[PDB]
């Protein structure tokens, strides 16, 4: 009932600047499955012996989606449950593996997150170099087929790379996009278990419907056939490994 909530947030290491570092692993928190107040209380007790002095936070957003989200009314609680100095004493916030969903999440909540907008303390890490299946770590360490110069079609199209592993698919933005007032790179991660549909529209276009996420993704690339075919391959390999 408890330990299940310590992997989400914990203290570990000391910043190069000599400050205590804390990690929030976003994908550990499942809204509805984990009591909100329990998590806050955990976080508070963990920060209590430190947050009177400068400290640093590492937000881990890899594979963060709707199920990892804070409901609006729960998000608000975080803005008033800590003493004032606790917010001020945060000297740095390193954001890791921010993705398309988080961007929409922060835009939807932009009026609440005004304080973070274009903040000097928020550092978006633009490259990773700085019985339960890991999945996330396996996906980021397995061999890949990389399709560069792809095009993600949206309100404004964006250069992206499409990386197909054996268990997951990554779409990495090749050009910066606006997030909380900053130009950053995004890295989406879709487990083969999340690809509900994958339709090949033409020789160099295709769509990708992600489970639990409304609007299907649309891409363009010279070798859309090979891309679509390899993704279908891993989706199949996953379905075959599921219990009958
Ligand atoms: C420091 C106490 C809270 C730490 C909680 C651990 C990390 C949890 C991260 C996920 C929840 C984030 C909740 C943020 C609550 C505080 C937001 C805030 O505004 O306080 C900031 C204090 O610094 C922080 O610690 C904020 C850290 C949150 C970073 C979030 C990054 C984007 C992730 C959003 C989606 C998360 C997915 C769920 C700055 O305050 P201000 O701008 O209003 O100051 C006014 C004067 N200018
Ligand atoms: Mg999800």
Curated annotation (Swiss-Prot):
Instruction: Using the record's annotation, list all stretches that form the CRAL-TRIO domain.
Output: 1-145
Cellular location(s): Nucleus; Nucleus, Nucleolus; Cell membrane
Tissues expressed in: Detected in brain, peripheral nerve, lung, colon and muscle.
> Result of mutating residue 21 to V?
In NF1; reduces protein stability
Source domain of life: Eukaryota
Post-translational modifications reported in the UniProt record: Ubiquitinated by RNF7/RBX2, leading to its degradation.
Documented effect of changing residue 111 to A:
Reduces phospholipid binding
Region Lipid binding, residue ranges: 1-244
User: What does the comment on domains in this protein's record state?
Assistant: Binds phospholipids via its C-terminal CRAL-TRIO domain. Binds primarily glycerophospholipids with monounsaturated C18:1 and/or C16:1 fatty acid moieties and a phosphatidylethanolamine or phosphatidylcholine headgroup. Has lesser affinity for lipids containing phosphatidylserine and phosphatidylinositol.
Known partners and oligomeric status: Interacts with HTR6. Interacts with SPRED2.
Q: What does this protein's UniProt record list under function?
A: Stimulates the GTPase activity of Ras. NF1 shows greater affinity for Ras GAP, but lower specific activity. May be a regulator of Ras activity.
Disease the record associates with this protein: Neurofibromatosis 1: A disease characterized by patches of skin pigmentation (cafe-au-lait spots), Lisch nodules of the iris, tumors in the peripheral nervous system and fibromatous skin tumors. Individuals with the disorder have increased susceptibility to the development of benign and malignant tumors.
Protein name as catalogued: Neurofibromin
Give the species: Homo sapiens (Human)
Protein's gene: NF1
Q: List the range of the whole protein covered here.
A: 1585 to 1837 of 2839
């Amino acid at each position: 009932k408890a330990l299940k909530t310590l992997s989400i947030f914990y203290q570990a290491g000391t910043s190069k600047a000599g400050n205590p570092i804390f990690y929030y692993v976003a994908r550990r928190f499942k809204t509805g499955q984990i009591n909100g107040d329990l998590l806050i209380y955990h976080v508070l007790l963990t920060l209590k012996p430190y947050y009177a002095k400068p400290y640093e936070i590492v937000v881990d957003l890899t594979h963060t989606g709707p199920s990892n989200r804070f409901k609006t009314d729960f998000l608000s609680k975080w803005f008033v449950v800590f003493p004032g100095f606790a917010y001020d004493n945060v000297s740095a916030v390193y954001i890791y593996n921010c993705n398309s969903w988080v961007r929409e999440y922060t835009k939807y909540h932009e009026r609440l997150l005004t304080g973070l907008k274009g903040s000097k303390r928020l550092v978006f890490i633009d490259c990773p170099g700085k019985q339960k299946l890991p999945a996330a770590t396996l996906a980021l360490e397995e061999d890949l087929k990389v399709f560069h110069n792809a095009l993600k079609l949206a309100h404004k199209d964006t250069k992206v790379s499409i990386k197909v592993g054996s268990t997951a698919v990554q779409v990495t933005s090749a050009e910066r996009t606006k997030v909380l007032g900053q130009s950053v790179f995004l890295n989406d991660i879709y487990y083969a278990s999340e690809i509900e549909e994958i339709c090949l529209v033409d020789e160099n276009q295709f769509t990708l419907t992600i489970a639990n996420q409304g609007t299907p993704l649309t891409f363009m690339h010279q070798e859309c056939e090979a891309i679509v075919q390899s993704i279908i391959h891993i989706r199949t390999r996953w379905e075959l490994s599921q219990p009958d």
